[PDB]
Write a protein that binds this ligand. Structure first.
Ligand SMILES: [Co+2]
Ligand SMILES: [Co+2]
Ligand SMILES: [Fe+2]
Ligand SMILES: [Fe+2]
Lengths: 314, 314
């Protein structure tokens, strides 16, 4: 189907090669950064991002999909810089990120009005730019599938139909929000194969993850490093298993790393003694080497990091 | 010099002239305007802002307090273009406007680290400018007093103590959220006379109102025009009753008009019927004349619109 890149003539589905499916160059709360720019440092952030991408490309990473959308502080101009300064393939997406309600702006507005916003970022461009969204991100968490949360999921379903672009979800692995995102998206006509249920690696309940995969969707083991949601040695033990059961065709791995996080749980103070080894290369340093160590083979890891992302964007 | 102004030198608590205590030059959602700027037209917004501000001046309005803060789309620089085009005593403020929870950025952070933000705008400047904040605005609505909501309130108190600036609040006149904000600010040291429970004019329940006034806190009859919450005539009737009971010295009147409201509930087409007369000079055309006509002398009004504000910023 061909995919739009941040500041590039665009590439074809089959030519994305080794790609990381959930990585944030930078995340912040639009509101806070707009009212207190003194808290942030573009230069310090820009560099932290450059070091990651380049040294992530050194490992062979050819494409990076960044699910940073509204609520996370998407910035197409910042992302465009990183591209010019690295040459990496960035796939920017659209959508909305919320756990409970929508900004007051969305009061008594139709799901169609929302989908329009997504379709705009896909057809027209992003933030007055020519860069187009190659997907749509949606979220759900502890609060569950709330009213406004469901409205976004449906707005996503429409955008998919109208554009054919895939969907990436943030979910809570413990409250079945992921399975619900799948139920709704499927009921609305979305192709399960065009759905990636995220943050499923945050659990070791193999029986639940399989239920989502058996329905034909991708299961997102996409938080290597964040030891707060699940230790690495226990995540690897989980991924290594779904692989033994032949679920590679639905397995997607990433870090969900944020070269720069304004989160109170990501301060330049906590990380050290919370999620130490949490880099955009944690998989090459541990995961992958571990898998090969358990006799997986290059074919399988090629499936997870090349074939899957390929089927996903086509 | 003790009360900050946008694009002007500070002034004394006095010579503030006829003032509108609660008016918005324009409101919007930080997140939405960033991600989808195609939804807004600054050219138009600017013309309307300057437009209204002028007519206000034509009626003797010398000062306007704009309680637009985080969540409502505060833009100091935009306010400058309005002041320079009118030369109005526009007072800017700091604070956070939420109904339920804070942006993930505040997750973990303490009520103390939040107060530090307001103080920056009060001492240093708003969004990296010499423009100081003359007050703090907190909010609470239908959802009630949530954890995050309460955190913001207590933070507001801290700021008042070290800065001396008053607090303008937003509440729901139907769920005691206003009284709560009152029983939570005074305790933190804040001087009751330095508070202003707003949106009390949205109800005809005289008992509920008098209760807040009977505690040294200013009552906010500040939504003239917004018939959705209460018709003009029924408001005029309510304010008159309060005056006829000596609650004059504690009464503050305004429109809470959004020369450019982002809410989807105030669409361009659904204007008439919902808030036809709604403007920033609706009180000079209706309210005031009504009052005079009903035994309220010129001194009282000068008390409500001139002195009361003074006491507020002292
Ligand atoms: Co997520
Ligand atoms: Co209000
Ligand atoms: Fe993420
Ligand atoms: Fe207001």
């Amino acid at each position: 189907m061909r995919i739009p890149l941040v500041g590039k003539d665009s590439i074809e589905s089959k030519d994305i090669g080794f790609t990381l499916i959930h990585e944030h160059l930078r995340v912040f709360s639009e509101a806070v950064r707009q009212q207190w720019p003194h808290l942030y440092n573009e230069d310090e952030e820009f560099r932290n991002a450059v070091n990651e991408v380049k040294r992530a490309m050194q490992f062979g990473v050819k494409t990076i999909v960044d699910p940073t959308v509204m609520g996370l502080g998407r910035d197409i101009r910042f992302m465009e810089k990183v591209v010019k300064a690295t040459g990496i393939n960035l796939v920017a997406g659209t959508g909305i990120y919320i756990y409970i309600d929508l900004p007051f702006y969305f009061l008594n507005r139709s799901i169609d009005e929302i989908a329009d916003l997504f379709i705009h970022d896909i057809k027209e461009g992003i933030q007055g730019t020519l860069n187009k969204a190659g997907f749509v991100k949606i979220a759900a968490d502890e609060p569950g599938i709330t009213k406004d949360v469901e409205k976004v999921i449906r707005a996503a379903a429409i955008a998919n139909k109208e554009t054919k672009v895939p969907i990436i979800t943030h979910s809570n692995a413990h409250n079945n929000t992921g399975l619900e995102q799948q139920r709704i998206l499927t009921e609305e006509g979305v192709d399960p194969g065009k759905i990636l249920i995220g943050h499923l690696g945050d659990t070791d309940n193999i029986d639940y993850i399989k239920k989502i995969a058996d329905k034909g969707s991708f299961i997102g083991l996409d938080r290597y490093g964040l030891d707060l949601f699940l230790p690495v040695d226990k995540r690897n033990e989980t991924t290594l298993r779904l692989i033994k059961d032949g679920y590679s065709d639905k397995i997607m791995i990433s870090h969900d790393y944020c070269c720069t996080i304004d989160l109170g749980t990501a301060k330049p103070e906590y990380k050290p003694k919370l999620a130490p080894r949490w880099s955009i290369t944690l998989i090459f340093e541990d995961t992958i080497p571990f898998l090969k160590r358990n006799g997986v083979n290059e074919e399988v890891i090629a499936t997870i990091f090349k074939e899957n992302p390929k089927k996903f964007f086509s």
